[PDB]
Amino acid sequence: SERIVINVGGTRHQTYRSTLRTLPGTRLAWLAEPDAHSHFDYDPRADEFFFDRHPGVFAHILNYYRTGKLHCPADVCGPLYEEELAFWGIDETDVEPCCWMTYRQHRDAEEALYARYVAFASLFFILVSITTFCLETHERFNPETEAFLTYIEGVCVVWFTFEFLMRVIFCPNKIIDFVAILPFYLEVGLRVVRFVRILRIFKLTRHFVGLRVLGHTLRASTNEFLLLIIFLALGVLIFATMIYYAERIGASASEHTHFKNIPIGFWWAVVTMTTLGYGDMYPQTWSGMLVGALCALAGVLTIAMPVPVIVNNFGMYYSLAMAKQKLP
Amino acid sequence: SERIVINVGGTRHQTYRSTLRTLPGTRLAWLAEPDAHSHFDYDPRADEFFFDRHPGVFAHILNYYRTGKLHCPADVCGPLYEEELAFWGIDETDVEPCCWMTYRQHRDAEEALYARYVAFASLFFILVSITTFCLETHERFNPETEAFLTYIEGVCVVWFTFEFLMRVIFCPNKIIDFVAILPFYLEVGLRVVRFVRILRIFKLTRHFVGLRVLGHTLRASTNEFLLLIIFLALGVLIFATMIYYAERIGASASEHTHFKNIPIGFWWAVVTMTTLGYGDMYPQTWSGMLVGALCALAGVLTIAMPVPVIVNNFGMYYSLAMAKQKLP
Amino acid sequence: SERIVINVGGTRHQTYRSTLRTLPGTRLAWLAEPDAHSHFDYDPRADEFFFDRHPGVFAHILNYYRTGKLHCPADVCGPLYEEELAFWGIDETDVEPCCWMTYRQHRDAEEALYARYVAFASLFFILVSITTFCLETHERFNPETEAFLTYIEGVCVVWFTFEFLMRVIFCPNKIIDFVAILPFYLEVGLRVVRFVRILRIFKLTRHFVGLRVLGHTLRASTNEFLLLIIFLALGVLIFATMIYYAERIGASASEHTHFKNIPIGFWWAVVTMTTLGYGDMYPQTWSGMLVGALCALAGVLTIAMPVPVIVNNFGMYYSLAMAKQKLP
Amino acid sequence: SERIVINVGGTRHQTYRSTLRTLPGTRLAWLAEPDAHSHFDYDPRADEFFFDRHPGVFAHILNYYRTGKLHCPADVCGPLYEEELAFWGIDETDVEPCCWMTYRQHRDAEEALYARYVAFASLFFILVSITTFCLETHERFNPETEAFLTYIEGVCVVWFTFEFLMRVIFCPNKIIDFVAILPFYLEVGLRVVRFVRILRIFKLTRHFVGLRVLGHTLRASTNEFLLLIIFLALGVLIFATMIYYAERIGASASEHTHFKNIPIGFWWAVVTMTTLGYGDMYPQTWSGMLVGALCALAGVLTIAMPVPVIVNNFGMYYSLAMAKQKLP
Numbered sequence A, B, C, D: 001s002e003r004i005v006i007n008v009g010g011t012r013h014q015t016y017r018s019t020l021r022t023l024p025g026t027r028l029a030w031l032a033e034p035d036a037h038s039h040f041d042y043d044p045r046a047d048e049f050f051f052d053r054h055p056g057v058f059a060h061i062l063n064y065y066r067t068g069k070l071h072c073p074a075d076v077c078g079p080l081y082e083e084e085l086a087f088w089g090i091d092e093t094d095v096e097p098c099c100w101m102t103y104r105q106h107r108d109a110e111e112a113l114y115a116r117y118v119a120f121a122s123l124f125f126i127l128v129s130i131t132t133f134c135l136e137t138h139e140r141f142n143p144e145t146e147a148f149l150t151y152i153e154g155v156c157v158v159w160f161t162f163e164f165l166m167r168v169i170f171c172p173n174k175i176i177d178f179v180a181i182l183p184f185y186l187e188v189g190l191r192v193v194r195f196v197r198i199l200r201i202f203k204l205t206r207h208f209v210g211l212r213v214l215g216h217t218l219r220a221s222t223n224e225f226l227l228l229i230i231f232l233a234l235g236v237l238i239f240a241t242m243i244y245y246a247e248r249i250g251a252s253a254s255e256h257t258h259f260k261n262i263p264i265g266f267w268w269a270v271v272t273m274t275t276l277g278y279g280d281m282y283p284q285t286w287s288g289m290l291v292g293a294l295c296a297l298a299g300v301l302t303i304a305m306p307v308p309v310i311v312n313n314f315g316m317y318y319s320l321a322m323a324k325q326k327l328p
């Protein structure tokens, strides 16, 4: 029945105390008791409680005692509204689900997001080791492998051993060591042997900002990969079956076509849904053609639906990383 | 000729009553009659009508008695403005068509959007039945089908019958039962027979949130599929005709090329507009090459025009579903 | 040196008259002369000029006499700010070029954007005529064309003549008639003859809202087509030359490869830049492979750069058309 | 302990001087000393300091002495807030990294972004020279090159020499001259010889606005090219190795498949990651098929992650160029 005047920095808001006592735990509710005159800045000639805060968002906080819900403005960023919430006693978890995903979310994007002359003296050997690995397989140095290649990689491993004689000698305590510095253990005496020779680049690929952002993205968006894989698996199964039966109705067995099984149809339905189209297997009857024309479009759609959700994350994280790089 | 002072929560707005009587059905219009002093909170010393509401949107409501049109702000969400509209007596259908699609919509996105150990004991059998179906066709277990596969699927159907001896016994009343629990009716005694064996996954594909959002999208956007199909059909017809005639002018019949008919040109014009390109049929004359270079681009455009409209829906619905999942 | 108080609807703005006389043609400038007391609503006890307008944008208008430039807010739509501009005497062409493309935009998107039982009795004949045209070419009804097909199309043309005996008889005056109702002139006595038989669908393709929006888009964005064609032509020329010379350095003539000319390289460079890839012509030397790996990416980029500009137009126009369809 | 009233144009903001002395270098801090009454517009009856500026952003400036951080509003553009910052003494480099990339951003998009009858008399010769170059290679005018083609290009070079007899004669001082007007030096007496004949179009391709915007984009976004190249190189290396070993486990050498080396796998892994798919090399074992189905998706993702960042730049720059073209 009575009115009180919350003067939030020059621009006074009036309300009924019956409105302020809707949520009795927060700070504003304390104003309503007949004791607040002994706690806050009560000017005893205009009866207004001074509160020296941003007056352009407090009219959205107070629009949580008036109606009953709490929304976020669109004229302030996340952290500004969050600081104001934290002040006034409101909880940052009553935000309605419409104004929540565009308010969390810079808070979910923070995400913790002269020996510099031998770093190149290690990168050079990393790259030459990658090259020697990629050339050991070529059937030009295998008339039986030529000796100069194993000599080169011997120099590489005798330098990597030298570098591994400091990361255990001068380190204080006791990921990129056990299953990533394995080729050093290997050369001294092939799939799992030398796949790891190429993994050493993931050691230095943390000093580049773009790959740090990519790594943070590939783990802050780990649901939109299950989603994409499940979409693609459903599509592959459905369209493999459809194309098998379609090609079958088009005239003692299936010897006039490529899709002889439902399994082998998975290869086709995945080189078609992705709009790849090698050309090893394609439809050859009008029913097969209709099913393929359906498959291409369904694939475009079920791939383009979650990939934008994946991509906005990288956009935001990379924008933040560059903004942090371009500021002192 | 007279002025009145609508004090909407501390920040008074003045107007002429001649402005407030533009729409005589709403609440504000009642203020103008020489009786409102007996209805509302009329402070009889400053002559201001108190109205204890958000003062940052009421200056957009009142900007519907001043000009004549009603627009929505961009510093508040949908539901906030909608609640304020509902209060003041304004109708939410006078919104101009520019400020309408970005005001409807969180209202069109709500869209209604220990026996948990046998659910896995049903999913296991669903998956093994899918696998046995996909392996019955392979020409490795058909020297004539091997007996262990029909034995396996017999175990599967004798478990699904057991599970179907409760969904009719203990159910109160009397979609996923008639045309989805058909293989149980089948095995006891092939296209329409066993296509349905794979449909059982659509029973469990409602417990995943991503597929619920996909299902809601595929039906809240059922116009943008007719649109895409019509675009693609027009493109296919036009470019099939163009490529037939083009390949024809390039020198007694058409025995030097692939496009011998206007029908068979549909397959090409749809594996090209989608940027698929198998390679079974391609142009082989300079006029055919120009028409194909036109077809690829027209296809990219007439596919990328409505697909973003389809994709924004999934983006919004999935954002809402995740926000609702991440909040108590 | 003196201050005056523009009371724009309850929320008074103070300024110096020396500020208001920056642009002497507009309305506000009239307030500054020592005569405005005889023109406007001058309350001669608080010395404030009443102006009964939106007080949330006038603080952006007045921020054109203070600094010297004119910007648009982001908390109001286009037409709202435009109406306020039109009132205050400001011109809508002084808007700075940053706040202009997001202010023009609904103004550039307006863009002018029981005989209903014989419309189907014409669409049926249109479709059957399209089908008879597409089947006249097939080498199944050409053992020499079978008589039933020309009989069918004779029925079609004898109905279209009947319908053309009203659009000249009962029309008041004197596009879709001369070069679109040509087959009627044709059958009574082949490229340009019967391409037009398929054009009749563009007569009815104006009653669908999606194709109306597509037609408005394809002409409100006629610069972003010259742009795309020029990008693609530059790319095609550059990469055709590059791939010719590359494939040439890889070891008396060029008889070991596909790219024997710079012209024929255009076909490849356009089925590759569009990520189509038929497979009729591909690189076969390491230099050719590097150039092709460059071509694919340059094509993706120079196609994806203007296509989003093309697509936003359709997005906006279609949103507007649907908003206008969903409102009385 | 004391309060002061910054009247920023009609809408007074109150604060404690203890708040205004948080940053003692800026202008507002001067208000707090017991001398400001002799410097600013101090009305000595309401004790308010007049400051005649936009009152809708100063409540965000002052929200930098209250909390400690500085954010940008979303209801004003970049340059407006920047002008207000510049006024008040605040530095435009304390902006928090969330509100920075959407505040820089028009400032990072400005970026410096009757002889007109012989310009066509040069473009004609440029185009005919391009055509003669592209036709010198064709094996239709090489029965040995026909004389009319070298005659034509002789006319072209004797006109380009004439035009090069003015750009050195009447030019005041002493890029598009040394390595771009080289064919004139060439014809008077082939890879590096005549690649440059096509470079002359880059001389005139600065008079088109679309290509000016493209050129500004291709250099304001030179990090997102290193990023894309590094993503693609990592992908190519990883998936080349994976597909080699996969195809190897699928059953004395590798004579049953295409991927015989890790190098040649780069061609495949780059015509697949880009969703090109020629069809010259594809997987032929189930493990190869799984790895290829992984490669297509990883390629789609690692290409679509930085390309939107590249594309937004062209969008913004082109919008600005068109807005500047459409305004006096």
Ligand SMILES: Cc1ccc(S(=O)(=O)n2ccc(C(=O)NCc3ncco3)c2)cc1
Residues within 6 Å of the ligand: A116, A119, A120, A201, A204, A205, A207, A208, A209, D230, D233, D234, D237
């Ligand atoms: C000391 C130092 C300074 C700068 C950088 S660095 O950040 O500038 N930098 C250089 C190369 C890479 C890289 O990760 N290359 C991967 C690759 N491409 C093809 C095969 O492997 C990153 C690293 C170390």
Ligand SMILES: Cc1ccc(S(=O)(=O)n2ccc(C(=O)NCc3ncco3)c2)cc1
Residues within 6 Å of the ligand: A230, A233, A234, A237, B116, B119, B120, B201, B204, B205, B207, B208, B209
């Ligand atoms: C009781 C329970 C708990 C969780 C889930 S669940 O939601 O986590 N869940 C699991 C599998 C699927 C699925 O739909 N798989 C489809 C498919 N992929 C390849 C062929 O078929 C969904 C379901 C039930």
Ligand SMILES: Cc1ccc(S(=O)(=O)n2ccc(C(=O)NCc3ncco3)c2)cc1
Residues within 6 Å of the ligand: B230, B233, B234, B237, C116, C119, C120, C201, C204, C205, C207, C208, C209
């Ligand atoms: C009287 C009336 C009512 C509705 C419509 S209508 O708007 O609903 N409508 C129907 C078909 C089309 C169309 O344009 N079809 C093109 C096509 N597809 C394949 C070949 O040609 C549009 C038209 C007329």
Ligand SMILES: Cc1ccc(S(=O)(=O)n2ccc(C(=O)NCc3ncco3)c2)cc1
Residues within 6 Å of the ligand: C230, C233, C234, C237, D116, D119, D120, D201, D204, D205, D207, D208, D209
């Ligand atoms: C005097 C004047 C006026 C207008 C223009 S102009 O700006 O309108 N203009 C015209 C052609 C181009 C162009 O760059 N063409 C490239 C190309 N396409 C295929 C091969 O090469 C640009 C230029 C000069």
Ligand SMILES: [K+]
Residues within 6 Å of the ligand: A274, A275, A276, B274, B275, B276, C274, C275, C276, D274, D275, D276
């Ligand atoms: K493709």
Ligand SMILES: [K+]
Residues within 6 Å of the ligand: A276, A277, A278, B276, B277, B278, C276, C277, C278, D276, D277, D278
């Ligand atoms: K392809």
Ligand SMILES: [K+]
Residues within 6 Å of the ligand: A275, A276, A277, B275, B276, B277, C275, C276, C277, D275, D276, D277
């Ligand atoms: K392709």
Ligand SMILES: [K+]
Residues within 6 Å of the ligand: A276, A277, A278, A279, B276, B277, B278, B279, C276, C277, C278, C279, D276, D277, D278, D279
């Ligand atoms: K292909």
